[PDB]
């Protein structure tokens, strides 16, 4: 299976007084492993997964240096973009950045990402070849030219194909008990009468990891989308995920309906036949 390492950065200007609120989180796949918050007392990158605590003092010293430098970059950027978009010094604005790398099932570099947004909208992104940029508007063309002149892409590509991958591999090995474990969904169905003549069938998928899953209802062996509700996949809080899908059916007819569950943790899709 492929694995990813991603870092997500959000900076929010507070023109009233002081520097931007800055929050950085790091993930391996769907597991957070580090965080920095400018408002926290430590002013350090902090662990958020047991397996990253294996890393000694020098790891933390290094990531703190870099994450603080990142915060200054996004502060400057908030100033610059305000200028490009001719905005008031009064209002709060946001810059978001996400970057990282995937390895394939062969544990080799697969893909690299670097995307940047201002005020919740695409601004600039590195293309898949890791050699050029996509600018969303004319302001972004300024940044594109500057980064092209300064060979940012080359620097990023070296990181993504190298350093990024190497550490991802290290993390996967150190945190193998959890990072490389697939938790298949624990499934069940509930039944709720909504009248004398109709009932709700709810098919639940619980405690699964990673978050990717497909839940669907079939009626007599054909997918059924009418009269169904599907909630978005949601975190349980213990590192796993939950989802459910529900259908309303005539009472007595529950047997026609089947819930189908697909997940990387299941060799074969599950078919629930009941209620």
């Amino acid at each position: 299976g492929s694995h990813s390492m991603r870092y997500f950065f959000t900076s929010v200007s507070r023109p009233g007084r002081g520097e931007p609120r800055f929050i950085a989180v790091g993930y391996v796949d769907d597991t957070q492993f580090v965080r920095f918050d400018s408002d926290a007392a430590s002013q350090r990158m902090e662990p958020r997964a047991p397996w990253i605590e294996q890393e000694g003092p020098e790891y933390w010293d290094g990531e703190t240096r870099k994450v603080k430098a990142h915060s200054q970059t996004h502060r400057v950027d908030l100033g610059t973009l305000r200028g490009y978009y001719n905005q008031s010094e009064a209002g709060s604005h946001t810059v978001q950045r996400m970057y990282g790398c995937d390895v394939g099932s062969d544990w080799r570099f697969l893909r690299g990402y670097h995307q940047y947004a201002y005020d919740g909208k695409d601004y600039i992104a590195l293309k898949e070849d890791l050699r050029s940029w996509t600018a969303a508007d004319m302001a972004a063309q300024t940044t594109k030219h500057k980064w092209e002149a300064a060979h940012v892409a080359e620097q990023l590509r070296a990181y993504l194909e190298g350093t990024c991958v190497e550490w991802l591999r290290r993390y996967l090995e150190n945190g193998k008990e959890t990072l490389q474990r697939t938790d298949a969904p624990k499934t069940h169905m509930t039944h709720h009468a909504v009248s004398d003549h109709e009932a709700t069938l709810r098919c639940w998928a619980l405690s699964f990891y990673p978050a990717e899953i497909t839940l669907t209802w079939q009626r007599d062996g054909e997918d059924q989308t009418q009269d169904t509700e599907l909630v978005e996949t949601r975190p349980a809080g213990d590192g796993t995920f939950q989802k459910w899908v529900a259908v309303v059916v005539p009472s007595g007819q529950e047997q026609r309906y089947t819930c189908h569950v697909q997940h990387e943790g299941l060799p074969k899709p599950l078919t629930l036949r009941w209620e």
């Binding site: 430098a69 350093t163 550490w167």
Partner: peptide, 9 residues
Amino acid sequence: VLHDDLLEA
């Protein structure tokens, strides 16, 4: 691990 040095926009 984080990238070492980001350029300003």
